[PDB]
Design an enzyme around this catalytic site. Structure first.
Site, PDB file in Angstrom:
ATOM      1  N   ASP A 118      -0.196  -2.860   2.321  1.00  0.00           N
ATOM      2  CA  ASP A 118       1.015  -3.700   2.566  1.00  0.00           C
ATOM      3  C   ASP A 118       2.005  -3.496   1.427  1.00  0.00           C
ATOM      4  O   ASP A 118       1.583  -2.941   0.402  1.00  0.00           O
ATOM      5  CB  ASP A 118       0.668  -5.196   2.550  1.00  0.00           C
ATOM      6  CG  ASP A 118       0.521  -5.876   3.903  1.00  0.00           C
ATOM      7  OD1 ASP A 118       1.415  -5.700   4.760  1.00  0.00           O
ATOM      8  OD2 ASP A 118      -0.460  -6.631   4.073  1.00  0.00           O
ATOM      9  N   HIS A 120       0.459 -10.835   8.302  1.00  0.00           N
ATOM     10  CA  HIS A 120       0.261  -9.440   7.836  1.00  0.00           C
ATOM     11  C   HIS A 120      -0.876  -8.786   8.619  1.00  0.00           C
ATOM     12  O   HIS A 120      -0.764  -7.573   8.913  1.00  0.00           O
ATOM     13  CB  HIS A 120      -0.004  -9.411   6.327  1.00  0.00           C
ATOM     14  CG  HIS A 120       1.164  -9.859   5.528  1.00  0.00           C
ATOM     15  ND1 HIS A 120       1.536 -11.199   5.448  1.00  0.00           N
ATOM     16  CD2 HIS A 120       2.059  -9.162   4.796  1.00  0.00           C
ATOM     17  CE1 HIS A 120       2.618 -11.299   4.698  1.00  0.00           C
ATOM     18  NE2 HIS A 120       2.962 -10.062   4.295  1.00  0.00           N
TER      19      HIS A 120
END
Length: 445
Positions: free
Chosen positions: A108, A15
């Site tokens: 995210d 990520h």
């Protein structure tokens, strides 16, 4: 003054890397500054710190007070970390607003609870999606699929087995599943969605996601977002052009001892040159485990004589190699990967044809994009479902490196590499998408 953006990443290199590359690309050609605001339930890894401390001085980072989660799935843990950090996040964003022209918070897919402090403070909430446009479309579709349920029809995508849907939804009884539904329903709160992909890679998914629909956020295709080893490079320098299969197995999961044994025989029997990044296998028999010289040495679990017999054509290294530099090298003719999206995009940007070795459900969805949709990848028979036999490994390595199938995949991958270069050019779709976001953030000043 000039615009400031906060970015709230997930734990895990997978990520962070694409969000860091987004942040670098934005500050490269814009007078913007950025703070990574990092929620934690424990000490970050040294690899995570390495990425943060290496960013340019326009990009700083703040860790929020650690949440105590004492009491399994990483998505439940991420979701609880963010939810229990909201007080800290609001006070941190307020402190940032008093030193910088804070206009936006980027989160995210599992960060939607952080929208609340952003909306409270009057800054724009944005979603950053570091995986495929297919995974984004599946995420958005989960509330509908949940109320519905033989192959899964993800909007805009090639159809996918139920058994291939990304791992947080592979158990509906689990907390991870109720969290995916929670975040999916909150997606329309975002003022925009930043997707790490490009049209020629995922035309179906992106066309679907970018269809203007009242009350759905715009989607910005900004991909591909991509980036001590001297002796490895010196080895590669000494091999002929296009000859080396790079087995990039330093990340993206662990092989069984059995699978690792079959992969060693299959590589040796191919007679092809290889650069194999090995990590310690799991599923190791007691007799092996207690008999190796060092338990920490991944190379100790290889077959007897394999390293000696292959030392002229194969370089085997522990845990790491400089993946971007290897994929750029003219001696690299193939890339065998667990099909993390970051790894795929690196291989695409450098025009290296792939052998897909997915282990996790999201890697299997990624492997469907490269094997079945754009066809820049071959896959060994059975991979992701069963142990792959040495003969199957020999067959796919020969197909890629010497076969007619390899030639076709290599030509398609060259054309996709050229599309990727166009996308990131001054007049390319990804550059335009970044400029579009820059204009949105500046208008908030």
């Amino acid at each position: 003054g000039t615009p400031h953006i906060a970015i709230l990443p997930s734990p895990g290199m997978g990520h962070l890397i694409p969000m860091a590359e987004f942040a670098k690309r934005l500050v490269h050609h814009h007078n913007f500054s950025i703070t990574f605001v990092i929620p934690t339930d424990g000490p970050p890894s040294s690899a995570y710190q390495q990425v943060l401390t290496s960013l340019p001085s326009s990009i700083d980072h703040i860790f929020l007070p650690q949440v105590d989660l004492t009491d399994p799935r990483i998505e439940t843990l991420i979701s609880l970390t963010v939810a229990r950090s909201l007080s800290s996040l609001r006070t941190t964003l307020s402190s940032l607003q008093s030193s910088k022209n804070l206009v936006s918070l980027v989160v995210d897919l599992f960060g939607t609870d952080a929208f609340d402090p952003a909306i409270e403070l009057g800054i724009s909430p944005y979603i950053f999606f570091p995986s495929t446009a297919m995974t984004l479309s599946l995420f958005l579709y989960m509330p509908q699929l949940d109320k519905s349920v033989d192959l899964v029809r993800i909007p805009g995508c090639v159809p996918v087995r139920g058994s291939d849907l990304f791992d947080p939804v592979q158990d509906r009884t689990d907390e991870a599943y109720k969290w995916v539904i929670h975040h999916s329903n909150r997606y329309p709160m975002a003022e925009g969605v930043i997707e790490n992909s490009f049209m020629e890679l995922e035309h179906g998914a992106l066309k679907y996601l970018q269809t203007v629909q009242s009350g759905k956020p715009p989607v910005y295709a900004v991909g591909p977002l991509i980036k001590s080893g001297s002796k490895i490079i010196e080895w590669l320098d000494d091999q002929p052009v296009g000859s080396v299969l790079f087995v990039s197995f330093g990340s993206g999961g662990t092989l069984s001892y059995e699978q690792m044994t079959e992969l060693a025989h299959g590589l040796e029997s191919s007679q092809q040159r290889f650069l194999w990044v090995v990590r310690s296998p799991n599923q190791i028999p007691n007799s092996t485990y207690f008999s190796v010289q060092s338990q920490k040495d991944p190379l100790a679990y290889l077959p007897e004589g394999f390293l000696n017999r292959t030392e002229g054509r194969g370089l085997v290294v522990s845990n790491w190699a400089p993946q971007a530099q290897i994929l750029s090298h003219g001696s690299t003719g193939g890339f065998m990967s667990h099909c993390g999206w970051n790894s795929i995009l690196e291989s695409v940007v450098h025009g290296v044809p792939i052998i897909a070795w997915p282990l996790y459900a999201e890697q299997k969805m990624n492997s469907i994009i490269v094997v079945e949709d754009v066809k820049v990848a071959l896959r060994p028979a059975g991979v992701g479902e069963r142990v792959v036999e040495r003969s199957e490994i020999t067959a796919v390595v020969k197909a890629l490196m010497e076969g007619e199938e390899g030639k076709k995949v290599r030509n398609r991958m060259k054309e996709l590499k050229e599309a990727a270069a166009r996308a990131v050019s001054d007049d390319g779709a990804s550059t335009i998408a970044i400029a579009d976001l820059a204009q949105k953030w500046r208008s908030s000043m």
